[PDB]
Symmetry: C4
C-alpha cells in the first residue's frame, strides 16, 4: 500500500475533526462529495457555481454545508472551506468502474487532478476516498473493532500454543534432547502468530484513535516473540548464523515464504524432503537464547562464548573460570551464565 495514500487515509481516521463530521453526515443520511485542493483558482474549470465561502473549517460547518446538493471544496490540510454547493465537472472520458454519478465523478476527478476526493452516498454508509488511481473504502469503527477483537482473540489462542511449545522445547533444550521437529513446530507457530499481526495491521490503522487499546493489546501479546524467534534460528540453524541473517529469515517467513515444516527446516540448512524425517534429526541449541534472555549477555559477547563452546550443553558444563577466558566475560557475566543455567536445570528438570 503506497505510503502516499496512507498519509491521505489519515485525514479521515477516527480522531480527526474531518472524520467526526463525516460520521455525523453518515448517521444523518446526508450525502457528501468533498474535493481537497490547495489552490482553488488553479481548478476553477472543474468547479462550477456554488457559493464561495473561504472560511475556517470546522466539523459543524462541514456537516451543515453537506445538507445542500453538490460538492464542498476544502484546503488540502483541512483548515479551510472554500466552496459549497458547486458542480464538479471532470473529463467524462476518464475511465471509471464506479457506480452512480457521485462516485464516478469522484474517481474521475481524483485521477484528473491527482488530488483527493471523498464521496459518501445517502443510501449506503461507507466513506470512499479517491486519491490518484487509488481508491480506499473506509469502514465504520464498529466493523473494525469487530474484526480486530476477533483477531486478537485468535492471537491469544496462538500465543498459548506457542508458550506450550516453547516451554516443552525448553525442557528438551536443557536435557539436550532436542529434535529438528521440535524446533520447527515452535518456529512454525511463532511465524503464524506474527503473520496474524501483519495481516491485521491495516485494520488497526483504519481505527486511528479508536485503535489505541488494540495496539496495546497486540504489544502485550507479541511483546518479545520476534527476538525469541530470531534467537531460536540462531541456536538451531544448520551452521553458524549472524543475528542480521536470522532477522531476515524471520521477516521472510512472515511476508513471503509459508511457515511449512519442511520449508522451515530446509531454510535452516537441513536437507529434508519428508516431513517425518524431522523427528529423526537430532539438534542442539548453540546457546544464544539462554545467554541473552536469561544470562542477559549481549548478543555481541555471546558470539564469543558460542565460539569457544559451540553449544549450550558445553556452556552448561563450563566453569566460572573457563567462561572467564572468554573475551567480554568478567566475574559477574561469568557467574551470571553459570548460576542462571544451573538454576533452570534444577527448576525445570
Amino acid at each position: 500500500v503506497p505510503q502516499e495514500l496512507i498519509e491521505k487515509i489519515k485525514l479521515i481516521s477516527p480522531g480527526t475533526e474531518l472524520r467526526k463530521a463525516l460520521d455525523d453526515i453518515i448517521n444523518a443520511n446526508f450525502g457528501a462529495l468533498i474535493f481537497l485542493v490547495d489552490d482553488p483558482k488553479k481548478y476553477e474549470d472543474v468547479i462550477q457555481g456554488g457559493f464561495w465561502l473561504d472560511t475556517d473549517f470546522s466539523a459543524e460547518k462541514l456537516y451543515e454545508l453537506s445538507k445542500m446538493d453538490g460538492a464542498i471544496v476544502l484546503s488540502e490540510d483541512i483548515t479551510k472551506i472554500y466552496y459549497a454547493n458547486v458542480h464538479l465537472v471532470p473529463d467524462p472520458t476518464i475511465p471509471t468502474g464506479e457506480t452512480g454519478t457521485r462516485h464516478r465523478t469522484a474517481e474521475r476527478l481524483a485521477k484528473q487532478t491527482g488530488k483527493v476526493v471523498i464521496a459518501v452516498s445517502r443510501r449506503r454508509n461507507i466513506i470512499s476516498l479517491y486519491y490518484k488511481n487509488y481508491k480506499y473504502v473506509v469502514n465504520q469503527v464498529d466493523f473494525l473493532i469487530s474484526k480486530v477483537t476477533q483477531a486478537i482473540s485468535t492471537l491469544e489462542k496462538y500465543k498459548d500454543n506457542f508458550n506450550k511449545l516453547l516451554s516443552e522445547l525448553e525442557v528438551l533444550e536443557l536435557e539436550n534432547r532436542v529434535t529438528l521437529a521440535d524446533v520447527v513446530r515452535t518456529l512454525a507457530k511463532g511465524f503464524e502468530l506474527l503473520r496474524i499481526v501483519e495481516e491485521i495491521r491495516p485494520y488497526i490503522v483504519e481505527l486511528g484513535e479508536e485503535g489505541r487499546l488494540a495496539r496495546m493489546q497486540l504489544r502485550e501479546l507479541t511483546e518479545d516473540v520476534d527476538d525469541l524467534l530470531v534467537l531460536l534460528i540462531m541456536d538451531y540453524s544448520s551452521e553458524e548464523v549472524e543475528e542480521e541473517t536470522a532477522q531476515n529469515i524471520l521477516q521472510d517467513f512472515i511476508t513471503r515464504r509459508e511457515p511449512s515444516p519442511i520449508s522451515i527446516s530446509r531454510v535452516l540448512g537441513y536437507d529434508v524432503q519428508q516431513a517425518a524425517q524431522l523427528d529423526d534429526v537430532l539438534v542442539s541449541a548453540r546457546g544464544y537464547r539462554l545467554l541473552k534472555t536469561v544470562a542477559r549477555i549481549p548478543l555481541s559477547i555471546g558470539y564469543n562464548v558460542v565460539r569457544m563452546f559451540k553449544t549450550l550443553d558445553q556452556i552448561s558444563k563450563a566453569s566460572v573460570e573457563d567462561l572467564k577466558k572468554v573475551e567480554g566475560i568478567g566475574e559477574k557475566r561469568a557467574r551470571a551464565i553459570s548460576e542462571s543455567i544451573s538454576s533452570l536445570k534444577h527448576r525445570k528438570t
Copy 2:
C-alpha cells in the same frame, strides 16, 4: 444436510458478489425474488413479461435491478443476468407452507423446476434460499459471529477443564494409579468438547469469508484433541484395540452415543452398571499415548513395543537394550522411549 444443498448455500455465502448485493438489498429494504437457471428458454412458461437483459452480472446491476417489482433471472453460475421485472408463475397447486406471495412463489417454483430460487422480503431481513424440497434460511453475519463467539468462548472453558483432567491423569499414569473413573471423566470431557465443535460447524460455514478467524480459533483450540482421545482409548480399553477401531469409538461418541460415564466405560469393554463402580476399577495405560506423543514412536512400531511389554509401567522399567529387542527400535528410538519416560517421572512426580 445434503451436499447438493451445501453447494447452493455457497452461492450466497459472505465473500461472494451475489451476497454483497443481497446485503445491499436488505440494508436498503428493497425486496428480492431471484430465479437461477441455465437455459431460460426451457422455462419460458414460468417466466412472463419483464425485460430481457442478457448481460454480465455484477452486484451493482443486481442491486439496481431489485429496485423494480417482480423477479430477476440469473444464470446458475451467477455470471449472467437474463431477466428482470418478470412475473414468475409456478403451479399454484404445488404444496407450500410459506407465507406471503413472494415466498410461496419461491418454494413452489423451486420444487417445480428443481432449480434454486432466492427470496428477500422488504419487511424482514433474512435470506431464504429454495432448492428442491429444501429450504435454507441464511442468517446475517452479525447473528452468526455472535453465536460463534459464544461457542468458542464455551470451548475455551471446556478445553480448560480438559487440560486439568489430562494433566492430573498424567500424574496418575506415571504413578500407575489410574482408575477407570479417571479415564472416563477425561474421555467424557474431550467428547463433549468435540461435540460443541461439530454442532457449530454449520454456523462457521454460513460465515464464509467472515468465518476465517473462527476456523483458526477452533483449530488452535482443538489442535490435537482427537488424536489424544484416540490414544486414550487405545491405552485404556479393556482389551487390545487397533487405532482404526478407536477412531470409530471416538466418532461414535461425537455423533450418536452420549458421553455418559457408564456408557463410555461400557463401550471400552468394562461391564459396569453403577457409576460409583468406576472409582473401584483399577486400570493401566498400555503406553501408546506416551510412545507416539512424547517418544515420537510411530503407532505402527508402538504396537510391537506394547506387544512385548503390555503396559507403560513395564515399558518404563525396560532398559535401552530390552527395548532394542523390539522390531522397529534401534538405538535412537530406544533412548527416546527411555529418556522421555524417565524425564516425565522426574518432572511431574
Copy 3:
C-alpha cells in the same frame, strides 16, 4: 419470584413460536395487546367486537393479525387464536401504575381476570407480561446476552483468584501451616463467586433457547465449587460438622449472610471480632476434602477415618495397616489414601 409466574414467562421465552411472533411484531413496530384465556365465553363481557377466528395458532397468523387495531385473544396453551381486533374493557376503577391506554388496560385486565395479558407498544420495544398482580418486563436477547457475557467474564476473574487461593491453601494444608485467615479468604471468594451465579440465573432464564451456551459456560466454571466449599467448611469448622450442616452454611452465605471475613470465621465456630485476629488463629484440616476428592473415599466412610485420626496431618502419618483398622477401609481404599496423600506432598511441596 413466584413459580406461578415463571411458568408464564416461559410462554414468551426465546425458542417459542409465540416469542418469534412478538419479535417480528417489535421489529415491525406494530403494536400488540394479547389476552390469554381458556374459555372465551366466560369472558365475553371484557371482550367487545373484533372478529371471531377460532383457528389454529401460528407465528405468522399472529403477526398478520397484529397489523390491526385492538387486542388478540389466544388459548392459554397458545394453540388457538380466538379473537382479533376486539375491544378489551376491564374495570376502569382497578388500580394501575402503568402509562398509556394499552398498558393500563393490560394490567387492569390481568388483575381482574387473574389471567395473562401481553402488551407491546409501537413506540418502545419491550415485551410487558401481566399475570395477576405481577408484571414482568421481558428484555430483548441482545441486551441479555450482553449482561450475561459480562457476568461470565467477571466469573472467570473470580474463578481465577479462587484457584490461586485454593492452590496456595493446598500448600499450607499439606505442610499443616494453615491459618483461619487463609481458610476464610478462600471461602469468601468461593461464596462471592456463587453469588454472581445466583444473581444472573434469572437472566439466563429470560434467554431461553438462547441461553444454552451460557448455561454450559457457567457449568464449566462452577463445575465443583459447591462441593469444594462444603468440604472446606467440614475440614476447618471449629468443631465436627455433618455435610448437611455444611451445605446449609454454604447456602446461607449465598443468599442472606454477606461473605464477610469476620462473619465467616464467626459462623465457622471461631469467636473473633477483629479481622486482624484471623492471621493468628492456627487451624488444621480434618481431611475430608482430601479423602473424597483425591482419595475418592465416600464421605460416609470418611467420617470414620476422621473419627480415628482427627486431622489430615495424622492421616498422612498413618500407615496402610492403621487405616485398615477403619470401618469401610480395605486394602484398596487404604493404599488410595496413603499413596494419594504422599504423592501430593512430593509434588506440591
Copy 4:
C-alpha cells in the same frame, strides 16, 4: 474534573429515573432542553410562557412532556416538574462555542444562572449537560461498555505479563540473584497496568448502575497490585524507605512521571543514565514483601526485622531464636517467617 460537576453527572447516570426518561427521549428522536432550578420565581425572567405544572416528577411525565416544543423546568433534586413548553431567554451576549439554538441557549443559560441545563437534539443522540462553565457529553451505555470491555481485556494482557515478571523475579529473589533491571521491568509493568485503570475510571463512572460488573472485574484484576508494588519499592529502593514514602512514588508513577526504565531506577535512588546499565546493578530485597504477604508479619514489626537483618537473604539464614530477639516477634511469628521462607525456597527453586 471538578467534584462539583461529578455530583451533576450523577443526576443523569444509568440507573436514575431521569436518565431512563432521557434514553426514551433519544430512542424516540424527540428533542429535550431541561433547566434545573430550586426556585423558579427567582428565574422568572429567563423563563417565558409554557405551562405551569408544579407536579411530582416521573420518567413518564418527562417523556410525554418532551413531545412538546421548548424547555422543561425541573427542581434541582429531580423530584418536581415546574414548567413545560417554556421559552428560555438567556443573555444573547454570553459567549458560547456551541451549534444550533438549543445548545447555544443551553450553555449560555447555564453560565448565566450557574445552574444545570440539559440538551438533547432530535438529530443526534448524545446527552449534553451544562453546569457553570463546564460541559459534559454523556455517551450511550453501549459505547461505554465497548470501550470498557476493551480496556479490561487489555488489562488481562498486562496482568498476565505482570504475573510472569513477578514469578520470575520471585525466583531471582529467593536465589538472591536480582538485578536492578529485573525490578524495574516488574515495576514498570505494574505502573502501566494501574495507569490503564486510572484512565478508564471516568468511563466506569459514566456507566453508573451499568458499571457494576466492570467495577467487579477491575477489582479482581487489580486486587493487590498496589500493595505489591509498594512492597517492591520498599524492598529494592537504594536506601531504606518508609511505606508512606513508597506509596507516594507509586502514586507519582501513575499520574505524572512516565514509567520509564531509566526514570524508575533513578527515583529508586540509583544513579543511571544508560538503560543498559540496569542489567549490571545487583540488588537484594530488603524482605518486606515476603514478610507481610507470605509471613503475614505487620509492616510495622517488619521494620524491626529488616533493621536487624537488612536483607531477605540474611533473614532466610536466621534461626527461630535469632528472629525471636526482634521486637514484636514471639514464637509464632518466628516460625512463620522461617517455615514460610524455607517452604518457598524448596518449592520455587
